[PDB]
């Protein structure tokens, strides 16, 4: 019985109630991993956001980080900040949807009518600073493209003044609600609980293994409370609604330490000369002219860095070969591995429940088929 879910993926399940589920993906395979092997490290930035396309910024970042370290660039204090405010602002964006699809299958339509408003509100914020609804070409190797507009902070305040509580109302809905058929047998328990199905159920699993708390790699100093719990399909839902909570305390927290200054590493071999002086520039004209035609050349080597648990552990494994284009780029891509859990996840339970069983893993095809 071959079926097409409701998220561009094929799943074959011989089972009369639930047996072996053979998922066939590759329907959105775009070859990213290879096409990037034919683009500027700068050009690649436009490619990174088209894989998770929800919490894109996670990729943007994770990729920059690899390269930044690779060629020893250093991010300005005020950038690091933007890069989390931005990153976590998107983390919310990703979850606002997971929570969205959780609302319909349930019934709460009045609330759903809000969720996809908070969303549009966040997205509006993006178009404010980056000029694009998404795939914002903002993160730059040295930091970010350009300083954020005067209208970003205030508006972020209007959305940061309501959500504080408007998360509990979403918790006060999936928790204390009578629709308890949420405690499905979907037990992502290869070894344990949900705290990992919250992060990266790769097989062996965990409870508080948040790659951005442990193996802390980028800006982090946040006293940021990770939400990992027990149970299994009821929590997968609850948990992520939980992450939204303090994920905002992060936005607030980091919105505090926002003092003006430089937004990207000035090191000329890594960044273009302020386009302000080409009317004099040594021949920084040369730099500019070169910087955009043939890019910079990171040292021969091989790096990788596990990025924020943006819907799961993530990281780019770039192989520089002293050229203007990466020699090889492998994206970890969480979903693609989280999807291995699914066969078991919904191994022994009623088919009718096998929908939320999957949506509970919050897989994104562009992320898996990449």
């Amino acid at each position: 019985p071959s079926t097409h879910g409701v998220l561009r993926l094929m799943v074959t399940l011989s089972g009369e109630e639930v047996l072996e589920v053979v998922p066939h993906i590759g329907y959105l395979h775009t070859g990213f991993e290879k096409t990037m092997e034919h683009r500027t490290y700068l050009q690649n930035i436009t490619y990174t956001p088209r894989m998770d396309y929800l919490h894109s910024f996670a990729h943007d970042l994770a990729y920059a980080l690899a390269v930044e370290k690779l060629l020893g660039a250093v991010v300005p204090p005020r950038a690091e900040t933007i890069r989390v405010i931005l990153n976590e602002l998107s983390r919310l964006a990703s979850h606002l949807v997971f929570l969205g699809t959780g609302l319909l299958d349930l019934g709460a339509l009045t609330p759903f009518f809000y969720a996809f408003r908070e969303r549009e509100t966040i997205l509006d914020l993006f178009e404010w600073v980056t000029g694009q609804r998404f795939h914002h070409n903002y993160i730059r190797i040295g930091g970010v493209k350009e300083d954020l507009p005067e209208e970003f902070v205030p508006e972020l305040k209007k959305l940061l003044e309501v959500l504080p509580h408007r998360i509990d109302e979403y918790e006060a809905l999936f928790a204390e609600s009578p629709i308890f058929y949420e405690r499905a047998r979907g037990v992502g328990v290869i070894p344990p609980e949900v705290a990992i199905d919250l992060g990266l159920t790769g097989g062996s699993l965990r409870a508080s293994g948040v790659n951005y708390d442990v193996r802390k790699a980028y800006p982090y100093s946040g006293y940021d409370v990770p939400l990992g719990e027990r149970g299994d399909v009821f929590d997968r839902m609850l948990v992520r609604i939980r992450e939204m909570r303090e994920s905002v305390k992060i936005i607030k927290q980091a919105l505090e330490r926002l003092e003006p200054g430089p937004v990207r590493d000035p090191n000329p071999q890594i960044t273009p000369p302020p386009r302000h002086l080409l009317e004099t520039s040594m021949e920084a004209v040369i730099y500019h002219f070169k910087h955009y035609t043939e890019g910079f050349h990171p040292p021969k080597g091989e790096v990788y860095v596990p990025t924020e648990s943006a819907r799961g552990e993530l990281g780019y494994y770039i192989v520089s070969d002293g050229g203007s284009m990466p020699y090889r780029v492998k994206v970890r891509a969480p979903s693609f591995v989280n999807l291995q859990s699914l066969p078991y996840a919904c191994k022994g339970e009623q088919v009718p429940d096998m929908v939320a069983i999957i949506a509970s893993l919050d897989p994104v095809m562009g992320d898996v088929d990449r």
Partner: protein, 191 residues
């Protein structure tokens, strides 16, 4: 992070250790002693949150042992009990005409082991099923497989074949200026 230390510790006998300036250190293992050794790494068996990648060194500036190579990433999950964070890679160069490599599916890296056969060559021996998460004919990731691109089209019969239009340079390419590369033969900032 003990575990990690104990790793190299003993493996400091016959195995080479490649370390990069950034916190990404990893160990190479010969062909043979991989199966058992990789298994041995089940010693306090890094929880095995293993992630993996398939590299093809053909068309690389500096020559390496064998054309294809594989990397794995064994890690001791920190939120468990004996999880401290011990993370490190491990690689194994694989023969061009003998693309084999015992699976490690012994929750795991089902997909990975597959992925590679999929895109690159690989072709692990033992394995539940060598499913294919790509499409059909040949192998793509391999550097000698055309990226297969169509010229972008414009009006009056003007077309741009990307291959020839790229300004960027592939580490192996000599550049547009005679035979030369300088502080653009790679570049890492000091400190």
């Amino acid at each position: 992070m003990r575990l990690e230390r104990v790793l190299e510790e003993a493996r400091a006998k016959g195995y080479p250790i490649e370390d990069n300036g950034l916190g990404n250190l990893w160990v190479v293992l010969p062909r043979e002693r991989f199966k058992e050794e990789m298994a041995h790494y089940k010693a306090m068996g890094f929880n095995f949150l293993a992630d993996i990648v398939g590299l093809d060194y053909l068309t690389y500036p500096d020559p390496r042992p064998e054309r294809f190579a594989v990397v794995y990433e064994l890690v001791s999950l920190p939120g468990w009990k004996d999880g401290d964070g011990s993370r490190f890679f491990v690689r194994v160069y694989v023969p061009e005409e003998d693309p084999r490599l015992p699976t490690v599916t012994d929750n795991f890296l089902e997909r990975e082991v597959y992925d590679l056969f999929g895109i690159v060559f690989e072709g692990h021996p033992d394995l539940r099923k060598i499913l294919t998460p790509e499409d059909l004919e040949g192998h793509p990731l391999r550097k000698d497989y055309p990226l297969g691109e169509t010229p972008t089209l414009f009006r009056e019969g003007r077309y741009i074949i990307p291959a020839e239009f790229r300004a960027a340079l592939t580490g192996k390419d000599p550049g547009l200026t005679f035979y030369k590369g300088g502080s653009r033969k790679g570049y890492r900032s000091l400190w």
